[PDB]
Each structure stands twice: as structure tokens, then as C-alpha cells.
Amino acid sequence: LSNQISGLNVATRNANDGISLAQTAEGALQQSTNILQRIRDLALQSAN
Amino acid sequence: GSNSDADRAALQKEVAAQQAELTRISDTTTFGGRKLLDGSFGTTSFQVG
Structure with a gap:
């Protein structure tokens, strides 16, 4: 039981690092979606 | 996360220190110069009758 508890705790920690990485x-x-929509605006403006 | 901590080398040093601590716990049990759990224990049998 102590093995399982400690494993689940370090797993909670590692999963927290994983959620932070996924958030980044x-x-x-x-950000890339904003840049791409900006390129779309410049492209449709470039119709001229 | 299988890719995040580039100091798995430091992790290896620390777990090596841990296993050396394990081998040291194996030693230093010199209860009579007949080390109990490490080395060569004769597998004795204490008489009670």
C-alpha cells in the first residue's frame, strides 16, 4: 500500500508537469493561430 | 515525461548513491564479527532445548 501511495503521488507530480507542458x-x-489569421488578413488585403 | 529532465545523468548519480547506501546498510551490521545479512552468513541454528 505504501508503494502504491508513493507511486501515485509521484505520478500526480509527473502528470502536473505534463499538464504544464501541454499548456505551454x-x-x-x-499564438501560431493568431499569426496565421494575420497572414490570412494580409493575403486577402493583397488582392489589391 | 520521458523527455523533459535532461539531468537523467544526475538522476543516475543519485540512484547510484542510493544503491551504495543500500550496500552500506548491508554492511555495518557487525553484530559479533559474523555479519548478518551481507557477506557470507553461515545460516546457523540457535539451540533452544
Whole structure:
């Protein structure tokens, strides 16, 4: 039981690091979506 | 996370220190110069009758 408890605790910690990494990745992806929609605006403006 | 902590080398040093501590716990049990759990224990039998 102590083995399982400690394993689940360190797993909670590692999962927290994983959620943080995924949050950074999703933030970068949202930034890239903004940049891409900006390129779309410049492209449709470039119709001229 | 299988890719995040580039100091798995430091992790290896620390777990090596841990296993050396294990081997040291194996030793230093010199209860009579007849080390109990490490080395060569004769597997004795205490007489009670």
C-alpha cells in the first residue's frame, strides 16, 4: 500500500508537469493561430 | 515525461548513491564479527532445548 501511495503521488507530480507542458504547447499553438489569421488578413488585403 | 529532465545523468548519480547506501546498510551490521545479512552468513541454528 505504501508503494502504491508513493507511486501515485509521484505520478500526480509527473502528470502536473505534463499538464504544464501541454499548456505551454497550447499557448504556442494559439499564438501560431493568431499569426496565421494575420497572414490570412494580409493575403486577402493583397488582392489589391 | 520521458523527455523533459535532461539531468537523467544526475538522476543516475543519485540512484547510484542510493544503491551504495543500500550496500552500506548491508554492511555495518557487525553484530559479533559474523555479519548478518551481507557477506557470507553461515545460516546457523540457535539451540533452544
